[PDB]
Ligand binder design. Structure first.
Ligand SMILES: C[C@H](Sc1nc(N)cc(Cl)n1)c1cc2ccoc2cn1
Length: 264
């Protein structure tokens, strides 16, 4: 069964998540909206989605993006998306700051862990508003709807659908976020021991929490189907840091906060 320590660890996680996650994005506003190596900088074709705003008043605005052609007109969705990253990243920074195990680390190590994990916890805070029947991320009054339902050739997508299929609980979707924020192997971490011991506690609690609350055959090898997911999320996260730095190197759009995160 679960111990008192584990129960208190999940409760601090769940608490921090409640307090710092706006699942309806009420406080997301005043954000922008669409009015050589380039070769590759057509990295934007992979992250292309149609966007929908409802008002409230009953209105609907819908944006359908263009087609890679000529050159520009594809950046037409780099300012708003950056606004969304910034809204997200701040929720993720508040999440970390309000966990005692995190506030206890030295400042320089908090900054290391945030820069390693911000993406990963976003993409997780995002799987839970993902709708895999319609392929869309329901962000409150905002929708980002995916434009062959077999092009999960896109890592990110192939990872959103897989994750979704697991039907994790809020306690899961939370512990996976601890496990990923506390990675000892992140550039610039000093207290590599403490952090490794912390991760190790978060894992064993996830594993107990599953063997305690999921006896069904569908849930077998789950804890591991989950750990491998995280290992994968680390890779997608590298591939996109890189992709994102390319776009930025030729068409600067990162907010200050994203500059801090990526050390620009
Ligand atoms: C906002 C980013 S895309 C993005 N595009 C850029 N050009 C730069 C940056 Cl920094 N981010 C995003 C949005 C959603 C919505 C659902 O899942 C998501 C995962 N990531």
């Amino acid at each position: 069964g679960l111990t008192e320590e584990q129960r208190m660890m999940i409760r601090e996680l769940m608490d921090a998540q409640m307090k710092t996650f706006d699942t309806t994005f009420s406080h997301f506003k005043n954000f922008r909206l669409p009015g050589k190596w380039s070769q590759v900088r057509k990295d934007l074709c992979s992250l292309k989605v149609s966007l929908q705003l409802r008002g409230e008043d009953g209105s609907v605005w819908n944006y359908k993006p263009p087609a890679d052609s000529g050159g520009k007109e594809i950046f037409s969705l780099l300012p708003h998306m950056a606004d969304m990253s910034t809204y997200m990243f701040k929720g993720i920074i508040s999440f970390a700051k309000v966990i005692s195990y995190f506030r206890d680390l030295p400042i320089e190590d908090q900054i290391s862990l945030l820069k390693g994990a911000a993406f990963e916890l976003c993409q997780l805070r995002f799987n839970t508003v993902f709708n895999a029947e319609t392929g869309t991320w329901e962000c409150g009054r905002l929708s980002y709807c995916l434009e062959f339902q077999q092009l999960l050739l896109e890592p990110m997508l192939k990872f959103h659908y897989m994750l979704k299929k697991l039907q994790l609980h809020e306690e899961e979707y939370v512990l996976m976020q601890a496990i990923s924020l506390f990675s000892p192997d992140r550039p610039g971490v000093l207290q590599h021991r403490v952090v490794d011991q912390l991760q190790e506690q978060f894992a064993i609690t996830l594993k107990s929490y599953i063997e305690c609350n999921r006896p069904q055959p569908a849930h077998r090898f789950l804890f591991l189907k989950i750990m491998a997911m995280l290992t994968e999320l680390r890779s997608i996260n590298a591939q996109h840091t890189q992709r994102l730095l390319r776009i930025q190197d030729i068409h600067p759009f990162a907010t200050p906060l994203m500059q801090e995160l990526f050390g620009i």
